[PDB]
Design a protein around this motif. Structure first.
Motif, PDB file in Angstrom:
ATOM      1  N   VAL A 107       0.815  -1.221   0.000  1.00 42.57           N
ATOM      2  CA  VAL A 107       0.000   0.000   0.000  1.00 42.57           C
ATOM      3  C   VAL A 107       0.852   1.276   0.000  1.00 42.57           C
ATOM      4  O   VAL A 107       0.626   2.184  -0.801  1.00 42.57           O
ATOM      5  CB  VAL A 107      -0.993   0.028   1.204  1.00 42.57           C
ATOM      6  N   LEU A 108       1.815   1.355   0.914  1.00 40.85           N
ATOM      7  CA  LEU A 108       2.586   2.597   1.070  1.00 40.85           C
ATOM      8  C   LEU A 108       3.520   2.823  -0.099  1.00 40.85           C
ATOM      9  O   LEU A 108       3.761   3.961  -0.508  1.00 40.85           O
ATOM     10  CB  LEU A 108       3.396   2.589   2.371  1.00 40.85           C
ATOM     11  N   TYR A 109       4.063   1.733  -0.621  1.00 40.06           N
ATOM     12  CA  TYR A 109       4.872   1.805  -1.821  1.00 40.06           C
ATOM     13  C   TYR A 109       4.064   2.405  -2.967  1.00 40.06           C
ATOM     14  O   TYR A 109       4.520   3.340  -3.628  1.00 40.06           O
ATOM     15  CB  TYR A 109       5.440   0.438  -2.210  1.00 40.06           C
ATOM     16  N   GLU A 110       2.862   1.883  -3.177  1.00 41.99           N
ATOM     17  CA  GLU A 110       1.996   2.398  -4.229  1.00 41.99           C
ATOM     18  C   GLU A 110       1.587   3.841  -3.958  1.00 41.99           C
ATOM     19  O   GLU A 110       1.522   4.649  -4.889  1.00 41.99           O
ATOM     20  CB  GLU A 110       0.767   1.510  -4.425  1.00 41.99           C
ATOM     21  N   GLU A 111       1.335   4.170  -2.687  1.00 45.45           N
ATOM     22  CA  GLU A 111       0.994   5.534  -2.305  1.00 45.45           C
ATOM     23  C   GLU A 111       2.149   6.482  -2.628  1.00 45.45           C
ATOM     24  O   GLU A 111       1.928   7.583  -3.129  1.00 45.45           O
ATOM     25  CB  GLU A 111       0.652   5.625  -0.806  1.00 45.45           C
ATOM     26  N   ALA A 112       3.376   6.054  -2.329  1.00 49.59           N
ATOM     27  CA  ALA A 112       4.556   6.866  -2.620  1.00 49.59           C
ATOM     28  C   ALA A 112       4.708   7.079  -4.134  1.00 49.59           C
ATOM     29  O   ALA A 112       4.954   8.192  -4.593  1.00 49.59           O
ATOM     30  CB  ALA A 112       5.818   6.206  -2.058  1.00 49.59           C
ATOM     31  N   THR A 113       4.568   6.012  -4.909  1.00 52.47           N
ATOM     32  CA  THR A 113       4.782   6.142  -6.357  1.00 52.47           C
ATOM     33  C   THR A 113       3.690   7.026  -6.989  1.00 52.47           C
ATOM     34  O   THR A 113       3.943   7.744  -7.968  1.00 52.47           O
ATOM     35  CB  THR A 113       4.892   4.775  -7.059  1.00 52.47           C
ATOM     36  N   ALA A 114       2.492   6.997  -6.407  1.00 49.05           N
ATOM     37  CA  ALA A 114       1.373   7.825  -6.875  1.00 49.05           C
ATOM     38  C   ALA A 114       1.569   9.290  -6.525  1.00 49.05           C
ATOM     39  O   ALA A 114       1.054  10.177  -7.213  1.00 49.05           O
ATOM     40  CB  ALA A 114       0.067   7.329  -6.294  1.00 49.05           C
ATOM     41  N   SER A 115       2.310   9.555  -5.449  1.00 45.72           N
ATOM     42  CA  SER A 115       2.402  10.911  -4.932  1.00 45.72           C
ATOM     43  C   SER A 115       3.671  11.638  -5.351  1.00 45.72           C
ATOM     44  O   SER A 115       3.707  12.867  -5.294  1.00 45.72           O
ATOM     45  CB  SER A 115       2.298  10.913  -3.395  1.00 45.72           C
ATOM     46  N   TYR A 116       4.715  10.888  -5.722  1.00 43.49           N
ATOM     47  CA  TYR A 116       6.021  11.474  -6.056  1.00 43.49           C
ATOM     48  C   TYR A 116       6.561  10.922  -7.371  1.00 43.49           C
ATOM     49  O   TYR A 116       6.135   9.857  -7.818  1.00 43.49           O
ATOM     50  CB  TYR A 116       7.051  11.247  -4.934  1.00 43.49           C
ATOM     51  N   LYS A 117       7.490  11.663  -7.982  1.00 42.99           N
ATOM     52  CA  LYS A 117       8.132  11.240  -9.216  1.00 42.99           C
ATOM     53  C   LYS A 117       8.768   9.878  -8.983  1.00 42.99           C
ATOM     54  O   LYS A 117       9.400   9.641  -7.947  1.00 42.99           O
ATOM     55  CB  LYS A 117       9.206  12.252  -9.647  1.00 42.99           C
ATOM     56  N   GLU A 118       8.606   8.985  -9.953  1.00 40.50           N
ATOM     57  CA  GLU A 118       9.178   7.654  -9.855  1.00 40.50           C
ATOM     58  C   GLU A 118      10.683   7.669  -9.579  1.00 40.50           C
ATOM     59  O   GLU A 118      11.186   6.829  -8.823  1.00 40.50           O
ATOM     60  CB  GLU A 118       8.884   6.843 -11.130  1.00 40.50           C
ATOM     61  N   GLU A 119      11.400   8.600 -10.209  1.00 40.57           N
ATOM     62  CA  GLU A 119      12.852   8.623 -10.096  1.00 40.57           C
ATOM     63  C   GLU A 119      13.336   8.973  -8.681  1.00 40.57           C
ATOM     64  O   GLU A 119      14.484   8.691  -8.345  1.00 40.57           O
ATOM     65  CB  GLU A 119      13.498   9.554 -11.136  1.00 40.57           C
ATOM     66  N   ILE A 120      12.472   9.575  -7.855  1.00 44.43           N
ATOM     67  CA  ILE A 120      12.888   9.900  -6.477  1.00 44.43           C
ATOM     68  C   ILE A 120      12.383   8.941  -5.391  1.00 44.43           C
ATOM     69  O   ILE A 120      12.711   9.094  -4.205  1.00 44.43           O
ATOM     70  CB  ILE A 120      12.598  11.368  -6.077  1.00 44.43           C
ATOM     71  N   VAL A 121      11.590   7.956  -5.802  1.00 42.31           N
ATOM     72  CA  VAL A 121      11.063   6.953  -4.886  1.00 42.31           C
ATOM     73  C   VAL A 121      11.915   5.683  -4.950  1.00 42.31           C
ATOM     74  O   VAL A 121      12.132   5.135  -6.036  1.00 42.31           O
ATOM     75  CB  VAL A 121       9.574   6.625  -5.191  1.00 42.31           C
ATOM     76  N   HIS A 122      12.384   5.220  -3.789  1.00 43.07           N
ATOM     77  CA  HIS A 122      13.221   4.020  -3.691  1.00 43.07           C
ATOM     78  C   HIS A 122      12.759   3.123  -2.568  1.00 43.07           C
ATOM     79  O   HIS A 122      12.526   3.603  -1.461  1.00 43.07           O
ATOM     80  CB  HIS A 122      14.678   4.407  -3.432  1.00 43.07           C
ATOM     81  N   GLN A 123      12.652   1.820  -2.843  1.00 37.40           N
ATOM     82  CA  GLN A 123      12.360   0.857  -1.795  1.00 37.40           C
ATOM     83  C   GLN A 123      13.654   0.448  -1.120  1.00 37.40           C
ATOM     84  O   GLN A 123      14.657   0.219  -1.803  1.00 37.40           O
ATOM     85  CB  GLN A 123      11.701  -0.394  -2.377  1.00 37.40           C
ATOM     86  N   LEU A 124      13.624   0.323   0.202  1.00 34.79           N
ATOM     87  CA  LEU A 124      14.776  -0.119   0.968  1.00 34.79           C
ATOM     88  C   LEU A 124      14.403  -1.355   1.777  1.00 34.79           C
ATOM     89  O   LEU A 124      13.472  -1.306   2.584  1.00 34.79           O
ATOM     90  CB  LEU A 124      15.236   0.982   1.935  1.00 34.79           C
ATOM     91  N   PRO A 125      15.137  -2.461   1.584  1.00 36.17           N
ATOM     92  CA  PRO A 125      14.905  -3.611   2.454  1.00 36.17           C
ATOM     93  C   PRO A 125      15.274  -3.261   3.888  1.00 36.17           C
ATOM     94  O   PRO A 125      16.310  -2.617   4.145  1.00 36.17           O
ATOM     95  CB  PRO A 125      15.871  -4.675   1.909  1.00 36.17           C
TER      96      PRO A 125
END
Length: 175
Positions: A130-148
């Motif tokens: 959910v939050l990953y999708e929320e982040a990608t929806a709210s911010y430019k893809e190039e500035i969103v990064h998933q961190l394990p």
């Protein structure tokens, strides 16, 4: 720190993924200001309404934004929250969505003393990304990064990576 342009960083992701541990360690090691949005809302009493099914005061999103805006404009803030769609997009230079394997996350939240319904909602929040999708929806893809974020070693890798990112950003934006 005076007269340096400094970046703002969002740490988001499901409760339990390690945002607070990461943000606090980053603040200590970079001198950036760490803001826990949940704690801020508690301290400044920024709640409006009560959600009866989740059993939690409802965050007053506008008031949180108003509370933080001046500081965000000045830069050098690491914001920690398990939501991100309501923040002004302009606030963040980079957004990290921390991710935790469902098994690990469950045990974390269990240890936190979450009951069954709360465990289920949060665990579904993670498994549905959910939050990953929320982040990608709210911010430019190039500035969103998933961190394990599953173990101390990954916390270590994340601290190292972000500290290096901060250094490079500061160099690039203070010619």
């Amino acid at each position: 720190p005076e007269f340096m342009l400094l970046p703002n960083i969002l740490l988001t992701g499901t409760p339990g993924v390690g945002k607070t541990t990461l943000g606090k360690e980053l603040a200590s090691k970079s001198g950036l200001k760490y803001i826990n949005v949940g704690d801020l809302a508690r301290e400044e009493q920024l709640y409006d309404g009560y959600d009866e099914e989740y059993d939690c005061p409802i965050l007053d999103e506008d008031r949180v934004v108003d509370e933080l805006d001046n500081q965000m404009r000045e830069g050098g803030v690491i914001v920690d929250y398990h939501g991100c769609d309501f923040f002004p997009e302009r606030w963040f230079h980079i957004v990290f969505v921390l991710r935790t394997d469902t098994n690990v996350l469950y045990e974390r939240l269990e240890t936190r003393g979450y009951n069954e319904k709360k465990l289920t909602d949060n665990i579904q929040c993670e498994i549905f990304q959910v939050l990953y999708e929320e982040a990608t929806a709210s911010y430019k893809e190039e500035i969103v990064h998933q961190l394990p974020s599953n173990k101390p070693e990954e916390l270590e890798n994340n601290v190292d990576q972000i500290l290096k990112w901060i250094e490079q950003w500061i160099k690039d934006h203070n010619s």
